[PDB]
A paper describes a structure:
One of the earliest steps in cilia formation is the recruitment of tau-tubulin kinase 2 (TTBK2) to the distal appendages of centrioles through CEP164 that is located at their tip structure (Bowler et al., 2019; Cajanek and Nigg, 2014; Oda et al., 2014; Goetz et al., 2012; Yang et al., 2018). TTBK2 recruitment requires a conserved WW domain in the N-terminal region of CEP164 and a proline-rich region in TTBK2 (Cajanek and Nigg, 2014; Oda et al., 2014; Schmidt et al., 2012). The structures of CEP164-NTD revealed a two-domain organization in which a WW domain is inserted into an α-helical bundle consisting of three α helices. Despite an element of inter-domain flexibility, these two domains act as a single unit whose stability critically depends on the core interactions within the helical bundle.
To gain insight into the structural basis of TTBK2 binding by CEP164, we first determined the high-resolution structure of the NTD of CEP164 (CEP1641−109) from two different crystal forms by X-ray crystallography to a resolution of 1.6 and 1.7 Å. The CEP1641−109 (CEP164-NTD) structure from the first crystal form (co-crystallized with nanobody 36Z) revealed a globular shape composed of a head, neck, and body delineating the WW domain, connecting linkers and an α-helical domain. The WW domain has a canonical three-stranded topology (β2–4 in Figure 1D) and is inserted into the helical domain. Intriguingly, Q11 is mutated to proline in a CEP164 allele that is associated with the human ciliopathy nephronophthisis (Chaki et al., 2012). The body of the CEP1641−109 structure comprises an α-helical bundle whose three helices pack together to form a highly conserved hydrophobic core. The WW domain packs against the α-helical bundle and is held in place by the interconnecting linkers L3 and L4 (magnified view, panel 3).
Residue numbers in the entry:
A (entry chain B): 2 to 104
B (entry chain A): 3 to 119
The structure:
Amino acid sequence: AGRPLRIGDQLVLEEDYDETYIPSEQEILEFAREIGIDPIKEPELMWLAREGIVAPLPGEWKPCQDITGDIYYFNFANGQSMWDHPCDEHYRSLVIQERAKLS
Amino acid sequence: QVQLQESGGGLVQAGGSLNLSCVASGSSHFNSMGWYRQAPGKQRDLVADISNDGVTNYADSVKDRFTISTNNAKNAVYLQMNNLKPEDTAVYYCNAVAVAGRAFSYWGQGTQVTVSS
């Protein structure tokens, strides 16, 4: 990556445009449950998980790792940090909305 | 899926060397890799980072003694450890991260290192 890898013990992860990672179905199902979908009983909602699992970050945000190796997300614009991907809250609300729609 | 598998630990005399290794599936190509260690009474702590293009970073306590490296496919991480000291005793862990918007972080199972005398 860049010549420095960490700033103040925090590793800042940078993704290239041509970088490619295809997650596993097991990971998609786990993310589905974490945003509130039952994958077995609610296949009609699973498109939200298949989109959300690889949701891009806004440019203000990077994935980071602390001195223990734990992943978090950092907003360089305002200095806020969070364990979740900043879009996960919105995917959880979309799941609720879409479950209602199909009912 | 990634299934990180570590090796190379055990008991060693002070002043000796080890070469820890961690290997993943061939279809893995990691953005970032690193070794960590959890010493008695201490939480898990960085040892060394390496990026996909080979740049490294070390904890100050090991920089002049350890060498982290990866392979050409970026799915294996190695830690050469020279001039081992009793304070290097810890459970070592390898970490590997892929990124696709979200970060996907994987860990090996833990590698006991005990330096005696």
